[PDB]
User: Fold Angiopoietin-related protein 4 from Homo sapiens.
Amino acid sequence: PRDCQELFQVGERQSGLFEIQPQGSPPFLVNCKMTSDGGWTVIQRRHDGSVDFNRPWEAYKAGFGDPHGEFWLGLEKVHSITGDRNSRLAVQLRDWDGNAELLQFSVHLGGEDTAYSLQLTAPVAGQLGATTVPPSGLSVPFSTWDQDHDLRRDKNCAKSLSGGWWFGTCSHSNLNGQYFRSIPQQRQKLKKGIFWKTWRGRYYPLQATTMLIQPM
Ligand SMILES: CCCCCCCCCCCCCC(=O)O
Assistant:
């Protein structure tokens, strides 16, 4: 089977670890979530800060962490699942009072030759906050501290924050930032945290995050 939706389609009901083999790829183990809307591949999960997410490009390309805990599936693995297909990207956030916010966007995801860019239509970039975006849409490369795509020549967004992310701006989101349990006092600290600006604010550190994907 090529992904979690294909496992769902042949009748798999249980969420957990499963072997898939996307086309052109060796087999590997993924976290599948089986829902009423088919199978979803978990590509990122964070809940307790046990796993260090401040990692360079090759770790973000290959994947890291604990498949039974916090992890990053890995951009190369994620792109072998999406191919060049339109995909649903689910983003689930938890704040410190147990409130959850469930978001979903249609995206395309490019290969490494695009630096694993997120490709958004103008309406979807509108959903995320972009106000002026041509009909050709928006393309946001992935960045890590050793491979940052900020065009400002003296500005490295990933190195200034933490982790790897599609830093369209350096102020929209970062679910791969540093895990914080409470109020940090050090100048320029909560800026490095796990945040999604339009939900709880630029400086609110989220308690838990899950990102999932489903091609088509
Ligand atoms: C689903 C992950 C989204 C990754 C970030 C791409 C968002 C494109 C930029 C959105 C507009 C930025 C506006 C802002 O900084 O508040």
About this structure: The longest helix spans residues 75-82. The domain at 131-207 is CATH 4.10.530.10 (Gamma-fibrinogen Carboxyl Terminal Fragment; domain 2). The chain is about 15% helix and 30% strand. Residues 89, 91, 105, 118, 125, 128-130, 140, 166, 168-169, 171-173, 197 surround myristic acid (CB under 6 Å).
